[PDB]
Design an enzyme around this catalytic site. Structure first.
Site, PDB file in Angstrom:
ATOM      1  N   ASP A  35       0.829  -1.198   0.000  1.00 37.23           N
ATOM      2  CA  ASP A  35       0.000   0.000   0.000  1.00 37.23           C
ATOM      3  C   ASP A  35       0.867   1.252   0.000  1.00 37.23           C
ATOM      4  O   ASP A  35       1.347   1.676   1.044  1.00 37.23           O
ATOM      5  CB  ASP A  35      -0.889  -0.008   1.245  1.00 37.23           C
ATOM      6  CG  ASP A  35      -1.810   1.190   1.318  1.00 37.23           C
ATOM      7  OD1 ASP A  35      -1.932   1.882   0.282  1.00 37.23           O
ATOM      8  OD2 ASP A  35      -2.410   1.403   2.402  1.00 37.23           O
ATOM      9  N   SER A 199      -0.775  15.668 -11.950  1.00 36.71           N
ATOM     10  CA  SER A 199      -1.040  15.333 -13.334  1.00 36.71           C
ATOM     11  C   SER A 199      -1.287  16.603 -14.141  1.00 36.71           C
ATOM     12  O   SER A 199      -1.822  17.590 -13.631  1.00 36.71           O
ATOM     13  CB  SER A 199      -2.239  14.390 -13.411  1.00 36.71           C
ATOM     14  OG  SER A 199      -2.661  14.163 -14.743  1.00 36.71           O
TER      15      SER A 199
END
EC number: 3.4.23.22
Length: 330
Positions: A35, A199
């Protein structure tokens, strides 16, 4: 040193991925959920409340000659999906794919929430976010990666998750055969303890690319792609009959649909998520309403590039002094 381990989807939907991990001496092999959105290595154990164990393999520290109680240390964690676990702490030898760390904090669960109990395939979590998020008190502990880092050939790990197929976590090297083209690297902020990046925009299907900054985290421990409501609405508007359902808990679409792809930007590069990756199947057995793999982050407080996004790429988690993230097509 390096390590290389295969990671395998737990079910037919790629809800999560498990990777075998050797703990203790002699080795006890547990299948852990790696994770990158958390920083605790915790396991089902001989200390876990019996009624909360249902099929998991447990770590038994008393059977390990290298286990030592970390006296006074406790831990307690809550995840974004509302699940939780807590307990005490041992140090022991931990190996992943041939890479060994001695003195790793292995957090033994005394209690786990229902979602963990109900998932017999996950024997615990191995956190790969920054150690500043580790929950051990009163002495915070380091992640497996942080402990391994100085011994690694290069201070990196890579995630190469499969679509309905096994993939690979590598430590200490970049497998240049595992991706196509070049890797595009992008800056990381560690301010919140995550692999947080920005992004450069998105496209829906064959549509034009929208240049827009989307701050989010690379999180292998989250199944879906969670993005701003504007972005998610633009995506689902291209699927006839798709709608957000408050009763179901997100966007659903007719199972008869063909889903468009979704592209996200990494610098000047583009990662394309095929439409099929966004199909999470019937909301309940036999239903003709299907659950979407792109959902709104509104009310999470953070955008999350979870498995839906990451499995479309070869992803480099560069833990050099100035951390960065790399993405390549594959």
């Amino acid at each position: 040193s390096t390590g290389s381990a295969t990671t395998t989807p737990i079910d037919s939907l790629d809800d999560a991925y498990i990777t075998p991990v050797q703990i203790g001496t002699p080795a006890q092999t547990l299948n852990l959920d790696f994770d990158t959105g958390s920083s605790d290595l915790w396991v089902f154990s001989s200390e876990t409340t019996a009624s909360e164990v249902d099929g998991q393999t447990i770590y038994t520290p008393s059977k390990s000659t290298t286990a030592k109680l970390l006296s006074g240390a406790t831990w307690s964690i809550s995840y974004g999906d509302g699940s939780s676990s807590s307990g005490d702490v041992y140090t022991d030898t931990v190996s992943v794919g041939g890479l060994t760390v001695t003195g790793q904090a292995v957090e033994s669960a005394k209690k786990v929430s229902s979602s963990f109990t109900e998932d017999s395939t996950i024997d615990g979590l191995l956190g790969l976010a920054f150690s500043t998020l580790n929950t051990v008190s009163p002495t915070q502990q380091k992640t497996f990666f942080d402990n391994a880092k100085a011994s690694l050939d290069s201070p990196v790990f890579t995630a190469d998750l499969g679509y309905h197929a096994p993939g690979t976590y590598n430590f200490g090297f970049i497998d240049t055969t595992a991706y196509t083209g070049s890797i595009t690297y992008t800056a990381v902020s560690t301010k919140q303890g995550f692999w947080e990046w920005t992004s450069t925009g998105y496209a829906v299907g064959s549509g034009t690319f929208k240049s827009t900054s989307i701050d989010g985290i690379a999180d292998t421990g989250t199944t879906l792609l969670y993005l701003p409501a504007t972005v998610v609405s633009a995506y689902w508007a291209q699927v006839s009959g798709a709608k957000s359902s408050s009763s179901v808990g997100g966007y659903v679409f007719p199972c008869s649909a063909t889903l468009p792809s979704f592209t996200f930007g990494v610098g000047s590069a583009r990662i394309v998520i095929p439409g099929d990756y966004i199909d999470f199947g019937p909301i309940s057995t036999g239903s003709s309403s299907c659950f979407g793999g792109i959902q709104s982050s509104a009310g999470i407080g953070i955008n999350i590039f979870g498995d839906v996004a990451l499995k479309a790429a070869f992803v480099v988690f560069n833990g050099a002094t100035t951390p960065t993230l790399g993405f390549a097509s594959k």
